[PDB]
Design a protein around this ligand. Structure first.
Ligand SMILES: CCCCCCCCCCCCCCCCCC(=O)OC[C@H](COP(=O)([O-])OCC(O)COP(=O)([O-])OC[C@@H](COC(=O)CCCCCCCCCCCCCCCCC)OC(=O)CCCCCCCCCCCCCCCCC)OC(=O)CCCCCCCCCCCCCCCCC
Ligand SMILES: CCCCCCCCCCCCCCCCCC(=O)OC[C@H](COP(=O)([O-])OCC(O)COP(=O)([O-])OC[C@@H](COC(=O)CCCCCCCCCCCCCCCCC)OC(=O)CCCCCCCCCCCCCCCCC)OC(=O)CCCCCCCCCCCCCCCCC
Ligand SMILES: CCCCCCCCCCCCCCCCCC(=O)OC[C@H](COP(=O)([O-])OCC[N+](C)(C)C)OC(=O)CCCCCCCCCCCCCCCCC
Ligand SMILES: CCCCCCCCCCCCCCCCCC(=O)OC[C@H](COP(=O)([O-])OCC[N+](C)(C)C)OC(=O)CCCCCCCCCCCCCCCCC
Ligand SMILES: CCCCCCCCCCCCCCCCCC(=O)OC[C@H](COP(=O)([O-])OCC[N+](C)(C)C)OC(=O)CCCCCCCCCCCCCCCCC
Ligand SMILES: CCCCCCCCCCCCCCCCCC(=O)OC[C@H](COP(=O)(O)OCCN)OC(=O)CCCCCCCCCCCCCCCCC
Ligand SMILES: CCCCCCCCCCCCCCCCCC(=O)OC[C@H](COP(=O)(O)OCCN)OC(=O)CCCCCCCCCCCCCCCCC
Ligand SMILES: CCCCCCCCCCCCCCCCCC(=O)OC[C@H](COP(=O)(O)OCCN)OC(=O)CCCCCCCCCCCCCCCCC
Ligand SMILES: CCCCCCCCCCCCCCCCCC(=O)OC[C@H](COP(=O)(O)OCCN)OC(=O)CCCCCCCCCCCCCCCCC
Ligand SMILES: CCCCCCCCCC(=O)OC[C@H](COP(=O)(O)OCCC(C)C)OC(=O)CCCCCCC
Ligand SMILES: Nc1nc2c(ncn2[C@H]2C[C@H](O)[C@@H](COP(=O)(O)OP(=O)(O)OP(=O)(O)O)O2)c(=O)[nH]1
Lengths: 341, 117, 52, 174, 368, 48, 168, 96
């Protein structure tokens, strides 16, 4: 990834381990794929010149090792009682499998490691943590037909990930609490349609992957670093900050589309109350999105005087502005898509 | 294996009787104040041996643990040669030992088998 | 500009995290083990005390 | 009778392991725990291979962990307690009495040994660890073994990357 | 570091120099090209030092000529007030607000007690930072060492000299200390430093050796201020650097000669610090593997916008460093609508650039 | 109406976010103990 | 198989009392024990064997007061008038809000909580008389898109199957 | 009853190992030893499952390999604590 080819090797074994996990027709192959993914993701997220990155790596290690051992325990119990790879009728060992998967995914009430560890990271490893490391536990939740435990996780995730993100002014913990709130929308789609979950995950990872690039290039680790961020035209900062209204679900931006397809598929499947509970949740998420959006919508700011030129990478800022165009004017591609039929 | 348990308990019993017979027949003199002290070549210690010890071969120890669980996958294939496909057995065995040689020679090239210092 | 948006009684005693994400570890003093090759040691020839 | 004795010893050592603050007490408790677990695992299989393998694994692991005991938390106080000794002794004598007054056919494991298998089983007459360990080197699951070789190489690369040898030795207050 | 005479001629490179100003060096470029294949005894950073008037430019140019190194003079504020097209932006000050007007070295000398002078000091540190990576791009990628007329490490003494004279408040000192704590830890300390020691009065005599008007009619060049620089240098800065760099102090009351200064350099054994891997001397410049050399070269070539974006820190409690929002918009509509900076400096049609219809190339590590 | 509306809703959500921030101020062992308690609850009901 | 294994709507409303008390207090026990289990370890740690049980009682017992007061108020309002309706659930919600006000010594919380729980009660009564379910079993459960059989990308060859669709 | 007479014991010992893993201990290496204990009890339960089936005990070495690489990851994390801190106290690490 950065500064070493061995990090590219670690990304390769990361992709290999996650794709080994999600393709497994047995829980043991999924478990060993999670072991490969954990092995790959410990060395990225470790840096000896940072005192808090090693603590974040330790928190990730302890949380994933506890969650992987409970997952193997209840998998072995499921094989002990109902000798095939699945269960005919739902029982408590399926709930233990789902709880051990929810500790890996970071959903509430097992969410507490996730923003407490994200303070120790950079932005690229944060993006790998809250997008790709949610492929393997969320795709394994799809094999379990449990409604009450998943519904409790959905309600707790959308309540906590909205409320909890109000207090932090640091962008990493705020974006982690935003990822907890968007995890509840993914888990709410997981028991109605796996394709609609894949679409919400792809567009959420797209909006995460374009909002990381604005913070990775300019090194914006705090809320007032946005207010002190220098741009050569204030209309450019006004346009670049529209991706938070996209991630808040405001039409006519691109991020209204995955929330909208989740709402359409939930109402077709006759769920209305938890959908209404997720309406009140995303207003608070849009509220703490707007405190970032204070830094560009007032058009003139009392700014620091010493900095005069802004600097960026070539290929990273070139790839950033392709997706910022599609995160604003992405609803003109509504006719091109054919997944949703 | 039940006989091995009983004879291991008998060897442990016999060694405890031997040590207790060495303790009973030992000369029983009074314990002096500075007789019981740690030796430290005849002088005062200045530090307990429970002081933390510097580890210069931590990488060698974890590589030893990794190589030992690699030993745990070699030991089957003595038996498996007579009962399997010869082609698959040779591809697995020569590829196993060549991957171990790549790893060991690569860490020899980096100098990670040398003690930290 | 605070550590959080709303400082509580416990929370307001905190400081701001650094704007650079990298925090270098400090260099702390180390007290090494004091072992003497005393006089009884055969490598110390009988009457040498090396306070290593 | 020996299996119920191993049950009682594993229960008593697990009570001891849950109550020990000092890392060396945990190390000795898990030494006798892995001894008793190795014997119990042997009872279930026709051959005694994986008990030996698990003993080499768990003696190759804690050999390193003692060096980290002597490098980190070398100085920590042992605290013997009479309550734990009395509890472990009373529970141990109670479970030996309960195992002596129990029917051992009902408490025996249903897993088939080498002699519990019937005479008509022609696969039982082969060499005792051949057909059990065959699928490590057979055609459907040699690729998992390939994946394990590459996984161990990637593990070693990870260990070399996040234990920088050129930063110096490790101790308390380095 | 062998000179031109002991080598028998001009310096020959150990390998081909990397075009670091034209080709971007990244992670995928680190496989084919390795950093330590070009390094030699001449690939060291030498920083010449001293007071206000000590003849640093001519001595540093002669040291660059004799040791076959690249000469890097001290950065002034004509690098940003005069852009790449030669248009000086000091003529824009009628249209600009008085809190956004141009402030350079002569504006500090005529008006010491101005607020933006504090900004000027901060600005100078950024400019020194803007050459030091340009120093470290030259040593790592080509293998030829550099000489620096002043260092980014050598600029907090100027801040404390303005602070003790009363030209800066506590707030600007705290701001510049916060930017220094934020930014100086990513740099590599130089290999060797040469300090030209001078008394407090003789530098003033050397002011009369320069005869420029804004430094003789000014007020700052007094007895207390130059003594403050001498005390700050010799009691904090050189003692902090001498734990890493081989310090060489010369008396320069006379004219001096650069050849004996060259001949003292080869008497230094630079291989005596490589016996201990934890030695404080040359600690930042030792690398145990070729991949660590390429890691540092990637950090100093592909992550120069990273180190320039580390300066983005928020400090709003001071009233000297905060630009007004109406004044900021007026400054933007004057400064960015000026000739020479309407667009990126490659693509400016108002200054005679041709072939813009088929041009899609941008400069690597270029200020937009 | 402002007591049942926006300003007091903001005050209530700020108080709830201040309370939920104190939930995250502990060590990892508390949350892992909570997960272990939840697994123990689901394993007791497997007997029942 | 006991009186503890009872539901709220196993009987028509007003017919049964003790089963409704046991059921509504069972949900109160579950909510209070769950909130107190995520309370006494996480924020305001009691650091004692007895104040932990005191915090358990503090987080549990007022929820029993809520459940018992709401169920008794709904039972009295159902047994008073002949018709069953929504404002019985509304005044039960106001009684539970009064229990909240007695807990927190704040009348305003007691009213606002009474209004909120009355709105919850009339919505639940609309659910039980209109027939719709709050969390129904999902009728449409997409396990994939179109061509879920057609995107098998495996490199191993399939052996011939042992099953046919042909009748014997 | 059948779940009680057979394999109910290593569930209890795994729960005790999980409670030993999450207990308030001063050092990280005690948690590493509790990880080794829950590896032992997962080996017991997986070994019961693989010995109901006849010739599928070859998988029991793969779990050992992934568990040893977990322990090696934990040991290297314990080394990387010394690169930043001077200690392995869990109170000394950052709570946020
Ligand atoms: C559902 C099912 C499961 C349910 C589980 C529930 C139970 C567990 C809950 C635990 C909760 C908890 O956290 O508790 C902590 C809590 C506090 O622990 P603690 O004991 O205070 O502190 C321990 C130290 O911290 C310890 O700190 P340390 O590490 O410094 O201590 C050193 C450690 C060091 O320990 C070791 O090194 C381990 C040694 C083990 C082997 C010893 C072999 C000896 C052979 C002879 O020493 C010990 O642990 C003592 C061991 C002594 C030897 C035991 C011998 C019997 C067991 C043998 C096992 C098998 C091995 C045989 C040999 C094999 C050879 C190959 O524990 C308790 O309170 C214990 C329970 C007590 C209950 C009451 C007991 C009965 C009443 C007693 C008083 C009677 C008064 C009568 C008066 C009559 C006149 C009026
Ligand atoms: C209290 C309610 C009243 C409050 C007063 C105010 C009036 C509100 C409206 C009243 C509506 C009518 C009252 C009523 O009875 O409704 C029943 C009704 C429940 O539905 P249902 O028709 O009875 O049947 C539902 C299922 O079909 C069948 O359900 P099930 O029997 O299968 O459920 C099993 C049950 C079984 O419960 C138990 O087993 C627990 C009790 C046993 C003892 C436990 C001891 C501790 C554990 C030991 C373990 C060994 O467990 C639970 O229900 C657990 C609920 C846990 C909730 C919190 C979860 C947090 C999880 C966090 C970690 C993950 O509606 C409600 O309860 C909704 C009202 C309450 C929420 C109001 C929110 C207002 C916000 C403003
Ligand atoms: C494998 C071979 C092991 C051979 C040595 C076995 C030693 C057995 C000691 C049994 C002690 C029992 C006991 O009560 O201990 C409490 C005592 C408490 O200490 P104490 O000093 O309070 O006890 C004195 C008790 N009275 C007053 C009654 C006489 O602790 C010890 O004895 C210390 C135990 C040290 C264990 C070291 C284990 C090392 C393991 C290394 C590998 C793993 C890492
Ligand atoms: C004190 C807190 C106690 C919480 C108890 C929660 C119990 C629960 O959710 O049970 C599941 C039940 C499931 O309900 P249900 O609709 O599935 O119930 C039908 C049950 N059968 C099929 C047996 C007839 O959840 C509810 O009843 C939720 C009702 C919410 C009512 C309030 C809505 C408005 C809220 C304010 C605006
Ligand atoms: C990039 C990944 C492309 C493939 C993803 C995929 O197959 O997704 C499942 C489906 C098509 O797969 P399918 O046609 O096999 O049906 C889904 C069935 N499963 C997932 C079980 C195999 O694709 C999508 O839903 C679209 C995902 C990409 C997002 C749209 C923009 C491009
Ligand atoms: C698909 C996978 C692609 C990457 C494959 C990498 C294989 C080698 C992995 C490794 O550990 O190489 C050792 C070293 C990497 O650099 P290292 O010293 O680990 O990092 C220092 C900076 N932090 O590498 C070297 O020193 C060798 C030079 C770089 C790698 C060249 C070969 C791989 C090219 C791709
Ligand atoms: C009846 C209507 C109830 C809701 C009214 C609208 C909510 C609203 O707009 O609240 C405003 C609030 C920000 O409050 P503001 O005015 O900015 O700050 C004043 C300083 N005390 O903003 C917020 O509170 C944002 C979060 C609203 C959440 C609504 C859904 C959950 C309840
Ligand atoms: C079930 C759904 C319950 C929905 C409740 C909605 C209202 C709410 O959250 O009330 C909590 C209440 C707020 O009280 P407050 O605003 O401080 O007022 C003080 C003066 N009355 O605070 C209290 O009354 C005290 C704390 C709440 C205790 C009762 C409510 C428990 C609700 C179920 C919790 C389930 C487990 C949650 C675990 C979360 C882990 C992070
Ligand atoms: C129309 C529906 C939506 C209304 C949203 C705004 C009103 C929310 C309820 C509310 O604020 O009620 C007021 C009451 C005040 O309780 P008290 O503890 O006295 O207030 C302390 C003030 N800091 O607050 C309470 O009693 C707390 C009630 C719990 C639910 C709060 C939901 C937000
Ligand atoms: C105090 C114990 C010290 C440690 C002993 C370790 C022995 C090797 C590990 C192991 O599990 O070996 C399996 C072996 C299995 O037996 P084998 O397969 O070696 O031989 C078959 C056995 C009569 C055919 C040869 O068992 C033992 O070695 C018995 C150990 C007795 C321990 C007594 C005290 C509890
Ligand atoms: N305010 C301020 N002035 C500075 C700073 N650095 C240099 N100057 C000014 C002081 C003098 O007017 C002038 C002297 O420049 P130098 O001391 O770098 O040397 P000079 O340019 O005279 O070159 P020379 O040594 O003669 O070759 O530059 C700084 O950080 N702040």
């Amino acid at each position: 990834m950065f500064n070493n080819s061995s990090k590219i090797l670690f990304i390769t074994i990361m992709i290999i381990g996650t794709l080994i996990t999600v393709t497994s027709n047995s829980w043991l192959g999924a478990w060993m794929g999670l072991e490969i993914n954990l092995l790959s993701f410990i060395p990225l997220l470790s840096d000896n010149n940072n005192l808090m990155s090693t603590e974040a790596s330790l928190k990730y290690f302890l949380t994933q090792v506890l969650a992987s051992t409970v997952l193997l325990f209840s998998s072995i119990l499921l094989m002990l009682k109902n000798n095939m790879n699945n269960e005919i009728n739902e029982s408590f060992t399926s709930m233990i499998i789902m709880s051990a998967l929810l500790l890996k995914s970071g959903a509430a009430p097992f969410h507490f490691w996730f923003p407490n560890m994200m303070e120790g990271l950079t932005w690229m490893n944060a993006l790998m943590l809250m997008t790709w490391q949610k492929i393997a536990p969320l795709m394994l939740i799809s094999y379990l037909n449990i409604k009450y435990l998943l519904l409790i996780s959905v309600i707790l995730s959308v309540i906590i990930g909205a409320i909890g993100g109000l207090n932090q002014t640091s962008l990493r913990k705020l974006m982690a609490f935003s990822s907890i709130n968007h995890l509840g929308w993914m888990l709410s789609s997981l028991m109605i349609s796996e394709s609609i979950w894949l679409i919400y995950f792809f567009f959420y990872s797209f909006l995460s992957f374009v909002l990381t690039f604005m913070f990775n290039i300019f090194k914006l680790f705090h809320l007032n670093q946005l207010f002190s961020w220098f741009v050569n035209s204030k209309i450019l900062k006004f346009t670049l900050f529209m991706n938070f209204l996209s991630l808040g679900g405001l039409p006519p931006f691109l991020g209204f589309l995955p929330k909208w397809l989740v709402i359409q598929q939930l109402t077709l499947c006759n769920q209305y109350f938890m959908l209404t509970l997720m309406m009140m949740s995303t207003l608070i998420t849009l509220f703490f999105y707007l405190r970032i959006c204070y830094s560009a919508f007032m058009m003139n700011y009392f700014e620091n005087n010493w900095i005069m030129k802004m600097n960026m990478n070539s290929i990273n800022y070139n790839m950033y502005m392709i997706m910022t165009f599609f995160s604003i004017f992405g609803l003109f591609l509504i006719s091109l898509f054919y997944f949703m039929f | 294996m039940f006989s091995i348990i009983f004879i291991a308990l008998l060897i442990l019993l016999i060694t405890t009787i031997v040590m207790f017979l060495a303790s009973i027949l030992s000369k029983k003199a009074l314990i002096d104040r500075e007789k019981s002290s740690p030796f430290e070549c005849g002088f005062d210690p200045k530090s307990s041996s429970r002081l933390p010890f510097s580890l210069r071969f931590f990488l060698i120890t974890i590589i030893f643990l990794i190589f030992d669980v690699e030993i745990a996958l070699i030991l089957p294939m003595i038996i498996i040669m007579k009962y399997s496909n010869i082609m698959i057995w040779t591809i697995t065995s020569i590829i196993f030992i060549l991957i171990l040689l790549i790893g060991l020679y690569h860490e020899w090239n980096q100098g990670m088998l040398n003690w930290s210092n | 500009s605070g550590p959080v948006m709303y400082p509580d009684e416990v929370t307001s005693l905190w400081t701001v995290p650094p704007w650079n994400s990298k925090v270098t570890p400090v260099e702390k003093s180390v007290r090494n083990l004091t072992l003497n090759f005393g006089p009884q040691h055969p490598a110390a020839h009988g009457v040498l005390r090396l306070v290593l | 009778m020996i299996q119920l004795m191993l049950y009682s010893l594993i229960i008593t050592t697990s009570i001891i392991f849950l109550n020990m603050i000092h890392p060396l007490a945990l190390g000795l408790t898990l030494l006798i725990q892995t001894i008793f677990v190795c014997l119990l695992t042997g009872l279930m299989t026709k051959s005694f291979w994986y008990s030996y393998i698990l003993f080499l694994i768990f003696l190759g692991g804690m050999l390193v962990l003692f060096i980290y005991v002597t490098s980190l938390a070398s100085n920590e106080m042992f605290n013997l307690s009479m309550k734990l000794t009395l509890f472990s002794s009373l529970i141990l004598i109670f479970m030996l009495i309960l195992s002596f007054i129990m029917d051992k056919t009902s408490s025996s494991l249903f897993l088939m040994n080498n002699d519990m298998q019937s005479i008509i089983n022609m696969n039982s007459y082969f060499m005792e660890n051949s057909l059990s360990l065959n699928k490590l080197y057979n055609f459907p699951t040699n690729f998992i073994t390939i994946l394990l070789m590459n996984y161990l190489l990637i593990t070693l690369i990870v260990i070399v990357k996040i234990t920088k040898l050129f930063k110096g030795p490790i101790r308390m207050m380095s | 570091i062998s000179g031109k005479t002991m080598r028998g001629g001009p310096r020959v490179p150990k390998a081909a120099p990397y075009p670091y100003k034209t080709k971007k060096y990244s992670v995928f470029n680190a496989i084919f090209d390795k950093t330590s294949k070009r390094f030699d005894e001449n690939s060291k950073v030498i920083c010449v030092e001293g007071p206000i008037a000590a003849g640093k430019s001519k001595f540093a140019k002669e040291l660059a000529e004799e040791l076959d190194m690249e000469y890097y003079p001290a950065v002034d504020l004509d690098l940003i007030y005069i852009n790449s097209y030669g248009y000086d932006m000091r003529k824009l000050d009628p249209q600009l607000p008085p809190s956004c007007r141009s402030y350079d070295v002569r504006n500090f000398c005529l008006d010491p007690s101005h607020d933006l002078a504090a900004q000027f000091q901060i600005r100078m540190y950024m400019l020194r930072y803007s050459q030091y990576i340009d120093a470290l791009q030259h040593v790592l990628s080509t293998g030829q060492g550099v000489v620096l007329e002043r260092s980014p490490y050598s600029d907090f003494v100027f801040m404390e000299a303005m602070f003790r004279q009363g030209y800066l408040s506590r707030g600007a000192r705290s701001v510049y200390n916060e930017l220094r704590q934020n930014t100086i830890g990513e740099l590599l300390k130089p290999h060797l430093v040469i300090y030209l020691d001078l008394p407090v009065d003789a530098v003033k005599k050397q002011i009369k050796a320069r005869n420029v008007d804004y430094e003789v009619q000014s007020k700052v060049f007094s007895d207390a201020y130059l003594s403050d620089l001498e005390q700050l240098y010799k009691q904090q800065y050189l003692k902090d650097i001498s734990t890493h760099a081989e310090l060489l102090i010369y008396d320069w009351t006379a004219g001096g000669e650069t050849e004996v200064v060259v001949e003292d350099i080869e008497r230094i054994d630079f291989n005596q610090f490589e016996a201990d891997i934890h030695n404080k001397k040359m600690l930042d410049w030792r690398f145990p593997l070729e991949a660590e050399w390429c890691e540092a070269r990637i950090k100093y070539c592909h992550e120069k916008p990273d180190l320039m974006n580390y300066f983005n820190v928020p400090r709003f409690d001071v009233p000297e460093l905060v630009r007004s929002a109406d004044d900021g918009k007026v400054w933007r509509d004057v400064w960015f609508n000026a000739p020479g900076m309407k667009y990126r400096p490659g693509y400016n049609a108002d200054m005679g650039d041709e072939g813009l219809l088929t041009k899609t190339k941008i400069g690597i590590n270029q200020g937009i | 109406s402002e007591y049942f509306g926006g300003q007091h809703l903001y005050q209530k959500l700020s108080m709830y976010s201040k309370t939920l921030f104190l939930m995250h101020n502990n060590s990892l062992k508390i949350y892992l103990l909570l997960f272990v308690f939840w697994i123990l609850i689901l394993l007791i009901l497997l007997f029942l | 198989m006991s009186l503890l294994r009872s539901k709220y709507y196993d009987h028509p409303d007003g017919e049964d009392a003790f089963g409704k008390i046991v059921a509504t207090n069972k949900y109160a026990v579950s909510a209070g024990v769950a909130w107190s289990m995520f309370d006494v370890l996480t924020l305001s740690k009691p650091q004692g064997y007895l104040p932990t049980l005191g915090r358990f009682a503090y987080n549990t017992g007022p929820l029993m007061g809520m459940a018992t007061a709401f169920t008794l108020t709904t039972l009295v309002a159902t047994n008073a008038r002949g018709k069953d309706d929504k404002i019985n659930y509304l005044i039960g919600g106001f009684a539970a809000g009064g229990v909240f006000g007695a807990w927190k010594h704040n009348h305003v919380a007691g009213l606002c909580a009474g209004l909120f729980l009355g709105i919850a009660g009339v919505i639940k009564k609309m659910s039980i008389e209109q027939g719709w379910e709050f969390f129904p079993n999902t009728p449409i459960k997409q396990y994939g898109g179109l061509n879920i059989a057609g995107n098998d990308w495996t490199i191993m060859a399939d052996p011939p199957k042992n099953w046919t669709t042909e009748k014997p | 009853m059948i779940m009680i007479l057979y394999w109910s014991l290593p569930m209890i010992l795994f729960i005790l190992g999980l409670f030993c893993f999450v207990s308030n201990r001063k050092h990280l290496l005690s948690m590493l030893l509790s990880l080794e204990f829950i590896v032992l009890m997962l080996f017991f339960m997986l070994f019961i499952y693989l010995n109901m089936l006849n010739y599928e005990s070859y998988f029991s070495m793969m779990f050992l390999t992934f568990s040893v690489c977990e322990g090696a990851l934990g040991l290297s994390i314990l080394v990387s604590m010394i690169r930043t801190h001077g200690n392995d106290y869990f109170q000394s690490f950052s709570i946020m």
